[PDB]
Design a protein around this ligand. Structure first.
Ligand SMILES: CCCCCCCCCCCCCCCCCC(=O)OC[C@H](COP(=O)(O)O[C@@H]1[C@H](O)[C@H](O)[C@@H](O)[C@H](O)[C@H]1O)OC(=O)CCCCCCCCCCCCCCCCC
Ligand SMILES: CCCCCCCC/C=C/CCCCCCCC(=O)O[C@@H](COC(=O)CCCCCCCCCCCCCCC)COP(=O)([O-])OCC[N+](C)(C)C
Ligand SMILES: CCCCCCCC/C=C/CCCCCCCC(=O)O[C@@H](COC(=O)CCCCCCCCCCCCCCC)COP(=O)([O-])OCC[N+](C)(C)C
Ligand SMILES: CCCCCCCC/C=C/CCCCCCCC(=O)O[C@@H](COC(=O)CCCCCCCCCCCCCCC)COP(=O)([O-])OCC[N+](C)(C)C
Ligand SMILES: CCCCCCCC/C=C/CCCCCCCC(=O)O[C@@H](COC(=O)CCCCCCCCCCCCCCC)COP(=O)([O-])OCC[N+](C)(C)C
Ligand SMILES: CCCCCCCC/C=C/CCCCCCCC(=O)O[C@@H](COC(=O)CCCCCCCCCCCCCCC)COP(=O)([O-])OCC[N+](C)(C)C
Ligand SMILES: CCCCCCCC/C=C/CCCCCCCC(=O)O[C@@H](COC(=O)CCCCCCCCCCCCCCC)COP(=O)([O-])OCC[N+](C)(C)C
Ligand SMILES: CCCCCCCC/C=C/CCCCCCCC(=O)O[C@@H](COC(=O)CCCCCCCCCCCCCCC)COP(=O)([O-])OCC[N+](C)(C)C
Ligand SMILES: CCCCCCCC/C=C/CCCCCCCC(=O)O[C@@H](COC(=O)CCCCCCCCCCCCCCC)COP(=O)([O-])OCC[N+](C)(C)C
Ligand SMILES: CCCCCCCC/C=C\CCCCCCCC(=O)O[C@@H](COC(=O)CCCCCCCCCCCCCCC)COP(=O)([O-])OCC[N+](C)(C)C
Ligand SMILES: CCCCCCCC/C=C\CCCCCCCC(=O)O[C@@H](COC(=O)CCCCCCCCCCCCCCC)COP(=O)([O-])OCC[N+](C)(C)C
Ligand SMILES: CCCCCCCCCCCCC
Ligand code: NA
Lengths: 482, 113, 138
């Protein structure tokens, strides 16, 4: 007899291998989920005391986490909404029903290996995934993962996130007054004279503290994850810009004590980054978060494609103009700077008479303000519209992943603060284990309504006689018997 | 402006004024948050850099709103000490606000309409 | 025998309760409008002098106004385009035909409880609805 439990060279059991072979196509997904069922059901007939899905390969990955780490949404959807109606293979179910009074029926989804579990949570493996990892953004649309995060959101993370937005706003209001009201005489550092000059130092000291704070939070993000050079520049666009803000802050400290006026050069960048980084905190809000995802995508596809061709044209005709100029705008900066005034609607077509050919000068600028202003800016708008039409759902599902990483980091930041995460669930008796003992599980309730499957003599209902939460129920002497 | 109320006796003008309502609420309010964050953001960064006039937060926020309406001088001060800082900071502004975020607004409206 | 006319704690009769249970999905709408018909037709066989739809709950709402105040467009569409071809349940029709010469046929829609009526007009209940009140616009 073959061994259901046996492992390969890489430690993958049969069920792990059903995950490696999945390819996110329907006929494969139709099959693998069918075959995932049968061996998983067979392993209750033979070897009834094993729990295959708890088996971990060489990389410590279960078949569920391996489906989530490898982008396998169909298998993930199967494993998570799994309901098995057979009696001796019911404990292997994962989507239960706790009551059904008419069209209403309250489902229970187990939360084993999804919440902040021991080895690899499905939320962590999805949320903290590498960037290739297909369907990062669709793996959370698999029910109950939306509702589970939206539960964590509405219960503890929303009230914490808005406190994080506040303490960051105050920090930006304080680093801004400490910068607006800076000394404009003498070299740094600057002694204290009056009371107004005492308040700013409280604002300057306290402002460096956040830079130290946002500096270590970027080191933690580095060592808690170990992101590759790729992942570092391609999906971590927030942590880059808070850490970068932190570097201009510390450079602003290194230079404020090195007697050099360049502290201002770094201090103003750290402001402009900082206020732009409130667009981070638009991710507690669905409409503003999706708006800020679109800003991300526009910068990366539409504007970067744009600014290459625009800088090629700009520097191209710029050299052609300053070459023609003779003794002032006989510089490459002032000509590149005047040719950028056209796109912003501030272009004088007669910013020099210091040339010798006027047809050459204006044919060359008309060539510029047709191919850049008329064509390439209005083309940009057209490209954005094409983009917005496409990334509408993609931006909603990058948002939910943004919010998810905030939910997880909030949980993981408060292992000590409150207690852990408030557990996002309840320990319910779904039935009995095949050895007769109780099957208590941390389960997420989802009320559902159905106007087509009226009769549905379920039986698999786990606590029908009490038909709700209410007080403790009867357990319904049906299918369970122990 | 409240004559735009009375466009509702007319099917084409009424529907036009409903779109104006929706644009203000979803497209423009989303826009003006991010625009005022950027504006006030780089504004503080500019007036911080300025030394003695446009050494004010109003006149800098007011000059940085001239860019979106196409009236932005990239040399409205020489009263600074760092010119790379001053122009990298305004180019950062008139790319992320004018090039990106206004033309993005048009794109959002088209999606809305 | 059950009482077609009886009321619950909140005053909702059976037909009011057919409105509260509607959820603007097709299979529910297919059903509730079917079942709305049958009790409404049954109430002409038994108790032929009642007019159930005129019954008002604790909040003074009829099943039509409650369908319009609660966003129930499928039930509203049913109640308003209601044409019953059976003879003894024809008075319970609401969309009539006054003539049909060839392909042309002139329909009549009752305007009871839509125009500026006494308690709650369907236009007022729709027009002066709270903002959640799904399908205000449909
Ligand atoms: C030679 C030069 C060397 C340079 C080396 C160092 C470079 C460091 C910066 C790199 C980046 C520079 C800017 C250009 C890149 C784009 C910026 C942007 O839009 O990224 C959106 C970001 C999203 O977050 P996240 O990462 O959480 O989202 C990820 C992400 O969607 C991922 O795809 C998902 O899979 C994942 O699930 C999800 O989680 O959102 C924010 O970062 C908040 C909003 C921030 C504001 C966004 C507007 C633009 C900001 C930049 C301009 C700053 C202006 C002041 C400049 C002053 C000095 C000139
Ligand atoms: C000391 C003073 C500091 C300054 C004042 C601020 C202090 C800090 C303030 C902290 C509190 C944060 C605001 C909470 C508002 C209520 C929440 C709510 O229900 O929102 C609703 C929408 O609401 C919006 O979309 C509002 C605009 C969102 C953008 C951010 C506004 C922040 C306000 C202040 C800006 C300050 C800027 C910086 C200023 C320096 C619900 O959201 P949704 O759209 O439904 O999406 C939710 C997701 N879901 C629906 C999928 C579940
Ligand atoms: C990304 C930047 C965005 C913002 C900038 C946007 C513009 C593009 C920026 C481009 C960056 C380079 C700027 C110019 C070179 C440095 C200065 C220098 O020494 O210039 C010398 C080269 O003289 C010339 O005429 C230039 C020759 C080509 C140099 C640039 C190579 C292509 C760079 C990419 C080009 C874009 C296409 C490809 C990329 C898409 C002389 O010129 P000068 O500067 O006067 O030097 C002092 C001379 N003086 C002693 C008489 C005073
Ligand atoms: C896309 C593929 C590549 C295209 C290549 C295109 C380039 C091919 C073209 C090549 C020829 C370019 C001109 C050569 C030099 C002529 C003299 C000159 O420049 O100035 C002279 C006269 O200045 C004037 O302004 C008077 C008119 C001059 C001739 C104008 C010809 C217009 C041709 C239109 C052709 C349209 C072509 C459209 C193409 C799409 C000297 O005078 P000034 O001191 O300089 O003038 C100042 C005094 N003022 C105020 C009294 C005037
Ligand atoms: C004392 C002097 C005061 C000033 C003069 C004005 C005096 C007051 C004037 C009162 C009369 C109002 C105009 C009536 C026009 C004819 C109606 C008609 O058939 O319209 C047609 C379209 O027509 C339009 O759409 C026209 C433009 C509509 C916008 C408003 C124009 C008002 C003109 C004056 C502006 C003044 C602005 C303020 C100036 C201070 C039909 O409409 P529709 O598009 O088919 O849609 C109908 C709905 N339906 C089709 C679904 C059924
Ligand atoms: C909605 C408005 C749209 C139109 C406005 C658009 C811009 C945004 C509007 C913002 C409203 C607030 C304006 C500034 C504060 C009031 C004035 C004051 O005392 O400033 C002090 C604070 O000095 C600073 O440098 C400012 C520090 C932060 C203050 C604003 C907090 C964030 C507000 C939201 C920011 C947006 C991002 C978040 C929200 C999306 C000093 O500066 P001052 O003013 O010179 O004071 C006199 C000083 N003097 C004696 C030396 C002369
Ligand atoms: C439905 C939609 C349509 C309806 C819309 C309804 C309205 C929408 C708009 C609303 C904006 C209204 C703003 C308030 C009125 C104007 C400002 C004012 O009074 O300035 C006065 C004082 O101002 C200050 O002292 C402000 C200092 C902070 C600067 C930030 C605001 C800059 C104003 C512009 C931001 C533009 C942002 C544009 C984008 C939002 C004048 O300043 P001053 O005395 O000459 O100099 C003092 C300088 N100092 C004190 C800073 C050193
Ligand atoms: C998005 C995430 C964050 C991004 C952070 C980005 C910031 C990182 C950058 C940081 C460095 C910024 C500059 C530091 C200070 C240098 C000196 C200075 O400014 O002026 C000095 C010289 O003024 C000049 O104009 C001469 C050239 C100065 C150096 C230019 C470097 C350009 C680097 C391009 C890098 C492109 C980076 C693009 C980034 C996308 C002092 O002279 P002045 O009196 O001021 O001059 C006036 C007299 N004049 C008319 C003769 C000139
Ligand atoms: C995430 C996206 C948003 C954030 C983005 C953040 C970054 C955004 C932007 C980034 C661009 C930053 C550019 C460097 C800083 C400014 C230049 C500088 O220091 O000039 C100094 C020196 O400059 C020179 O000498 C340059 C010579 C080459 C000219 C080409 C660049 C012209 C700059 C503009 C191109 C505009 C292009 C606009 C479109 C790209 C000042 O020059 P000067 O001493 O007075 O005169 C010397 C002249 N000569 C030496 C040439 C003879
Ligand atoms: C809803 C949120 C957005 C709207 C509100 C935004 C905030 C309020 C809006 C606008 C600010 C208005 C101007 C502030 C006073 C001027 C500067 C000053 O006196 O001290 C210094 C800087 O100031 C600081 O660093 C902050 C502390 C200021 C002192 C008074 C306590 C304020 C506490 C605030 C606690 C944090 C903020 C509140 C949250 C905890 C001045 O330094 P200096 O080198 O001596 O320069 C001389 C200046 N002087 C001659 C004019 C004296
Ligand atoms: C004169 C004035 C009178 C009034 C004064 C008023 C005072 C006003 C208040 C604050 C002023 C600034 C104090 C420092 C905080 C900076 C801002 C900050 O932390 O924002 C964070 C909130 O932060 C929190 O929710 C926790 C608060 C900070 C704790 C550590 C403070 C730094 C000390 C030294 C620590 C050194 C060791 C570091 C490890 C402990 C931002 O939230 P986040 O969740 O981090 O998300 C951003 C990061 N991410 C986007 C990249 C994910
Ligand atoms: C406006 C914020 C502070 C700008 C100066 C930075 C240098 C350090 C100042 C205070 C000392 C911190 C240790
Ligand atoms: Na203009």
């Amino acid at each position: 007899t073959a061994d259901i439990s046996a492992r390969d060279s890489v430690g993958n059991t049969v069920l792990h291998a059903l995950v490696e072979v999945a390819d996110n196509t329907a006929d494969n997904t139709k099959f693998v989920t069918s075959m995932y069922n049968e061996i998983l059901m067979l392993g209750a007939k033979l070897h009834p005391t094993l729990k295959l899905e708890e088996l971990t390969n060489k990389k410590g990955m279960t078949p569920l986490a391996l489906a989530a780490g490898t982008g396998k949404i169909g298998v993930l959807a199967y494993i998570l909404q799994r309901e098995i109606q057979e009696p001796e293979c019911r404990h292997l179910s994962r989507k239960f029903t706790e009551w059904a009074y008419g069209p209403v029926h309250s489902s229970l989804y187990d939360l084993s290996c999804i919440d902040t579990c021991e080895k690899n949570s499905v939320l962590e493996v999805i949320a903290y995934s590498s960037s290739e990892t297909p369907n990062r953004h669709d793996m959370l649309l698999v029910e109950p993962l939306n509702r589970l995060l939206q539960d964590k959101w509405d219960r503890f993370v929303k009230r914490i996130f808005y406190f994080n937005f506040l303490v960051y706003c105050l920090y930006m209001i304080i680093f801004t007054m400490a910068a607006y009201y800076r000394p404009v005489d003498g070299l740094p550092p600057f002694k204290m004279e009056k009371t107004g000059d005492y308040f700013r130092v409280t604002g300057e000291i306290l402002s460096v503290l956040g830079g130290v704070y946002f500096f270590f939070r970027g080191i933690q993000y580095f060592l808690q994850r170990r992101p590759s050079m790729k992942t570092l520049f391609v999906d971590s666009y927030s942590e880059m810009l808070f850490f970068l803000q932190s570097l201009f802050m510390l450079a602003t400290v290194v230079l404020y004590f090195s007697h050099l006026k360049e502290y201002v050069a770094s201090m103003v960048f750290s402001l402009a980054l900082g206020w732009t980084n409130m667009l981070y905190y638009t991710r507690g809000f669905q409409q503003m978060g999706i708006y800020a995802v679109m800003i991300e995508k526009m910068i990366l596809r539409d504007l970067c494609r744009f600014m290459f061709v625009y800088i090629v044209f700009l520097f191209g005709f710029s050299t052609a103009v300053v070459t023609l100029i003779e003794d002032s705008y006989n510089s490459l900066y002032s000509t590149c700077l005047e040719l950028f005034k056209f796109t912003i609607g501030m272009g004088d077509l007669e910013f020099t008479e210091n040339y010798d050919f006027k047809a050459v000068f204006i044919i060359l600028l008309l060539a510029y303000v047709i191919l850049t202003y008329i064509l390439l800016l209005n083309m940009l708008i057209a490209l954005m519209g094409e983009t917005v039409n496409k990334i509408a759902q993609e931006s909603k599902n990058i948002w939910k992943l943004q919010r998810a990483i905030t939910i997880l980091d909030t949980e993981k930041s408060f292992l000590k603060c409150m207690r852990k995460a408030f557990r996002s669930g309840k320990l319910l008796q779904v039935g009995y284990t095949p050895d007769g003992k109780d099957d208590y599980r941390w389960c997420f309730r989802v009320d559902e309504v159905n106007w087509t499957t009226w009769n549905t003599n379920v039986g698999i209902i786990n606590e029908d006689p009490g038909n709700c939460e209410g007080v403790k129920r009867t357990l319904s002497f049906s299918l369970r018997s122990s």
